[PDB]
Design a binder for this molecule. Structure first.
Ligand code: HEM
Ligand code: HEM
Lengths: 457, 457
């Protein structure tokens, strides 16, 4: 169809190797699928690269215009935000993960009783939105149940950004010159709605901070408002309201669809291997049963963690990392000048036959169950679930626990199967990998071990 | 590939004078009915804006994405129109004369070396040299030279034509990634043009202060008869930015339009030798080698018809873009606000239902001594200069410009399609360009009353 462009890039990769140039007219793109070269760009010589095309496109959509900002502004804000995601914060977020997942479970119980089919991708999107809003700026979207102005303003921003997501493979369409004016206006309206909502949250929290008798420190957390926003305001760092709003927006977007896609593809993947569902159930039944998981449970949910590890391998979010050279460099042996637009295919890295045995196989036990958890260091940049180098994910522990909690709880409560006559599960791509027409599943209440024998009348 | 108006012609033959073209969630109304076009363009013009075309043009020209108050232009149009009075147009005939003669000198040289000429390019230079002088008293000398400012004009032109809207999809990578650099490159060219305009304004402001002439409807400083001078002598309170914009508007409006008319006229002439004969016969008789004067204009009847007929077969532009800004009825069909409309002038001009032998180059389809054809005359089946409140203000200027140019060239030279010349095909935008140029063979014409000539052995 209008295939996810990383599929053609995979085929081209098998032929042409870990670095090749894609030419189309007077413009070209470098496609990097070599772990060493990816490590060079992302980590060893990261300072020679910007986010190029992706940054420019994203800035335009978000109202920041066509002038690339000083990169040191973000480096500064990132340094300020990272400490907010400390050990104690992540532990407190586990509770939020549990209750939010339970709300989804309530929705699933209802659908199961009525024997209805569910579209899981949509539901995972609502769940993770509710989580990130609460976690980041202490707001309850309640998108699992409602569709409000701000909820719709978020998805309008999302849909628009994804529609502008860059692909080096030409498609059949009318140029969008005619569309710039109306699209930017519609988006601007949605952004103002979100920003006004954020403004009310900033003000509310500033007030809570002034009235506090708490010393700020690296492990600071007001227990009544443990959000990142609260941490940032208790810091005393001088930041404009515009910048702070922009930061909250960044993490909302970074932390929403990412986890939703990971849950979606994990559950798709689970349908393809019943024996994996078996091991998963066995662990969850033993370790947590019906309990909301706690920080101590995370170490013990080993097989669940690996399932997530393996899902992110087969379906990376995003499947491509965009860069642009801003200085001279050598990629392997190949000299390059400033101005090269580069696509690092995480999809190719993760599924490379040269670096993975049975690359297309869903096998959570390809990394020893009791060994170390796989990461970009571990796997020599053949595995990049959370990126690598200075621009890597800052929500990686947050998101790992979020998804382990969600998977574990759901797998405890329900049996999931591909619905009869459900649409085929195909991919579209952007910031994350979406399904083409949803993930339609049959959900039934699971008969748990140690259930009391039941007898209908 | 094809100029999109070609498929719209075929669709028009099937579906008639008004139909909806659908592609996804968006659609365009294609109007080819003279009555409906008269309704939109004239009778109920107030229910329509220039929609997509205006938005696309505003962006490229540095005016952003919020449409200005339409009343601003209506005000400025009222101020500019009086500048193109009878006395002014007469004085421009001299300029038309001398510029065409300069092209003739270039053509004389090429004939001597037996070189082939690419006429579209040369007509573009000719009309650029004419419009710059007539509008803001500047000599581009593009017929002889290549400067930065000349290149800045064509850089703007090329970009605008590349963004010109087509309702028919093409095969390409979306240009979201290119918005920032394109906007920047153009802005650089625009600044160069604007700085030149600023210097011209200043020179003229001083010349106006030190002159002792009363302003009136027939005002014209004989030393600087340009439109710019008239506007400054008016006393109209207008900002420099606005004035610059007006000069840009007319530069663009009066440049490529005439070039395309000359280009397609000369293409058409190669297709009908008997028309060239009649043309030569008239020109030999009426003006000979003389530069035409205002009095010659009435007498150059067949030349006028050749131009009339060229504009019929190759309208500039081939489509007029509108958008409904109120409710309306198009024929019988009810319409809401927000409809994007393409009036196909190409279809109107070539409709078999309204023209006998519509594809035939026949300057005598309007009786030679009858009235000159116009939008009133032809009941909106003929729109060389548009119609209604947004119609061309340079229509008399341009009609004389082209008659002068055609007449002189046909007096002096024989033109033929060059051997092995590229095929003449069409691309489209604000005007109809050829795909690969109009390569012609040019030889000095043996005129009646030429002294018998004998080359030396
Ligand atoms: C399964 C969930 C997630 C995945 C797979 C993921 C993945 C990634 C990846 C691969 C990058 C690097 C992109 C690049 O280098 O171009 C990134 C960046 C980032 N992530 Fe995540 N992420 C997830 C969840 C989160 C969460 C929950 C947060 C915050 C609470 C977050 C915050 C960020 C931020 C702020 C960046 C930009 C860092 C920078 O540019 O310096 N992410 N993410
Ligand atoms: C053969 C040459 C020309 C042709 C075929 C032509 C054709 C047209 C047409 C069809 C329109 C109306 C477009 C629409 O309604 O969307 C128009 C508008 C206009 N023309 Fe011309 N034109 C020519 C030369 C000129 C010249 C020489 C000038 C000025 C010196 C000029 C100034 C303008 C202006 C300012 C407008 C905009 C009117 C408005 O929006 O109210 N044009 N032209």
């Amino acid at each position: 169809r209008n295939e996810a462009f990383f599929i053609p890039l995979y085929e081209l990769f098998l032929t042409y190797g870990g670095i090749f140039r894609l030419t189309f007219g007077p413009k070209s793109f470098l496609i990097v699928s070599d772990p060493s070269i990816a490590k060079h760009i992302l980590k060893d010589n990261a300072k020679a690269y910007s986010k190029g095309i992706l940054a420019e496109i994203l800035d335009f959509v978000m109202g920041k215009g066509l002038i690339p900002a000083d990169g040191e502004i973000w480096r500064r804000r990132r340094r300020a935000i990272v400490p907010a995601l400390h050990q104690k914060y992540v532990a407190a977020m586990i509770s939020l993960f549990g209750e939010a997942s339970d709300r989804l479970c309530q929705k699933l119980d209802a659908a199961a009783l009525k024997g209805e089919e569910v579209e899981m991708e949509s539901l995972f999107s609502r769940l993770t939105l509710d989580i990130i809003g609460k976690a980041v700026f202490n707001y309850d979207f309640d998108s699992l149940t409602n569709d409000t102005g701000v909820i719709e303003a978020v998805y309008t921003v999302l849909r628009e950004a994804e529609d502008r997501s860059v692909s080096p493979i030409p498609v059949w369409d009318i140029p969008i010159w005619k569309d710039i004016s109306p699209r930017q206006r519609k988006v601007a309206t949605s952004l103002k709605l979100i920003n006004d909502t954020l403004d009310d949250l900033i003000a509310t929290c500033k007030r809570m901070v002034e009235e506090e008798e708490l010393q700020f420190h690296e492990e600071y957390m007001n227990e009544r408002d443990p959000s990142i926003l609260h941490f940032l305001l208790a810091s005393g760092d001088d930041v404009s309201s515009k910048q702070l709003r922009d930061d909250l927006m960044t993490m909302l977007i970074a932390g929403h669809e990412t986890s939703a896609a990971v849950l979606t593809w994990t559950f798709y993947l689970l349908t393809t291997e019943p024996s994996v569902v078996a091991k998963l159930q066995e662990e969850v039944d033993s370790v947590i049963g019906d309990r909301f998981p706690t920080i101590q449970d995370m170490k013990k949910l080993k097989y669940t963690t690996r399932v997530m590890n393996e899902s992110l391998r087969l379906y990376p979010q995003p499947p491509v990392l965009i860069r642009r050279s801003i200085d001279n460099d050598i990629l392997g042996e190949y000299p390059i000048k400033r101005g090269e637009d580069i696509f690092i295919s995480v999809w190719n890295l993760h599924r490379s036959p040269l670096h993975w045995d049975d690359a297309e196989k869903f096998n959570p036990e390809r990394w020893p169950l009791d060994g170390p958890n796989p990461n970009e260091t571990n796997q020599n940049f053949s595995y990049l679930p959370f990126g690598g180098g200075p621009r890597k994910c800052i929500g990686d522990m947050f998101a790992s626990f979020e998804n382990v909690v969600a998977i574990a709880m759901l797998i405890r409560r329900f049996n999931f199967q591909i619905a009869p006559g459900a649409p085929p599960v195909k991919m579209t791509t952007g910031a994350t990998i979406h399904t083409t027409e949803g993930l339609k599943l049959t959900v039934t209440k699971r008969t748990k071990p140690l259930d009391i024998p039941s007898v209908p009348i």
